[PDB]
Ligand binder design. Structure first.
Ligand SMILES: O[C@H]1C[C@H]2CC[C@@H](C1)N2Cc1ccccc1
Length: 330
């Protein structure tokens, strides 16, 4: 089997991407944030505290003929940005892009933090990191990808995120029309439950490539590119007037600037992030200070290849017995 679903930016900045997901019988379609940095499929629901729902579409298990309470199971998750959610668990039929899993754990939110209530466009998350990170207790649950394995033609999914445009998540096949050149594969460590890999270095604009190992994760659920302070300082030193602002919480730059590209290494291959991808616009409406898309990972404890980096590439998440990542230009 395969599946193919379109993913759409939630706003003009590509802050996140939503993908329609069918849950239950008859189908209830919710728009989920596919997150390769977490392992829970959780939704706004009929159980979510009413004052914490503002515009989201909810999953109502009582209206699904295939929903069953997963008796005793609870979940609670905290993300890298300080956001959180928790609740109870149902199993139900979940379909993405024509690919169906029966008996998927659907984690029903009873509580969500402010960042979720305040985002009407995101109805929940669909985690695509390794199932070892799933938070359900006392019986840990599998991701949608882990459950779909074995029906897939090839044990893979691909992320093809758009710049200010829709893109695609595919399950079970490589679309050889979706990228240019060849795919470069690189080793993955699953020790922390992430799609963790080691970039071979970087370049700023037209500058020379610096060969240096940068461990980090491929995380579709993180907006920005978070890299070591040395690398990030080297990038922003090429933008006149750029500075790190403690008040704003990262590097800002004059909105009148033209940003240089940023290149990262994948083995002997190179992925080039155009400068325009690194512009996240005014820090507040009407400001001439713009927020940078490359930020320091110091304090976060891991480097994160988030959407800024991933949307410059066609990315293969290879879930074979020995997982690997692949990157191609597009
Ligand atoms: O206050 C809420 C949380 C954030 C910041 C503004 C708006 C509502 N959300 C945009 C956003 C969504 C997904 C990822 C990154 C940013």
């Amino acid at each position: 089997s395969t599946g193919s679903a379109t993913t759409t930016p939630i706003d003009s900045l590509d802050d996140a991407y939503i993908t329609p997901v069918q849950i239950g019988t008859p189908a209830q379609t919710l728009n989920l944030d596919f997150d390769t940095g977490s392992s829970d499929l959780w939704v706004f629901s009929s159980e979510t505290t009413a004052s914490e729902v503002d515009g989201q579409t909810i999953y109502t298990p009582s209206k699904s003929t295939t929903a069953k309470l997963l008796s005793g199971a609870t979940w609670s998750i905290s993300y890298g940005d300080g956001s959180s959610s928790s609740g109870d668990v149902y199993t139900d039929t979940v379909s993405v892009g024509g690919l169906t899993v029966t008996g998927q754990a659907v984690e029903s939110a009873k509580k969500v933090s402010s960042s979720f209530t305040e985002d009407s466009t995101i109805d929940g998350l669909l985690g695509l990191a390794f199932s070892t990170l799933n938070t359900v207790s006392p019986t840990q649950q599998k991701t949608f990808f882990d459950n779909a394995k074995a029906s897939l033609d090839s044990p893979v999914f691909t992320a093809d995120l758009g710049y200010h445009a829709p893109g695609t998540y595919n399950f079970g096949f490589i679309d050889t029309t979706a990228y240019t050149g060849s795919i470069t594969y690189t080793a993955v460590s699953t020790k922390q439950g992430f799609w963790e890999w080691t970039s071979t270095g970087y370049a700023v604009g037209s500058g020379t490539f610096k060969s240096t190992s940068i461990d980090g994760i491929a995380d579709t659920g993180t907006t920005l590119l978070y890299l070591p302070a040395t690398v990030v300082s080297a990038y922003w030193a090429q933008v006149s007037g750029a500075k790190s602002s403690s008040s704003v919480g990262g590097y800002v730059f004059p909105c009148s600037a033209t940003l240089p590209s940023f290149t990262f290494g994948v083995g002997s291959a190179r992925i080039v992030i155009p400068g325009d991808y690194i512009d996240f616009g005014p820090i507040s409406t009407g400001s001439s200070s713009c927020f940078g898309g490359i930020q320091s990972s110091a304090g976060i404890g891991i480097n994160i290849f988030g959407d800024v980096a991933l949307k410059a590439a066609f990315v293969v998440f290879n879930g074979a017995t020995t997982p690997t990542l692949g990157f191609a230009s597009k």
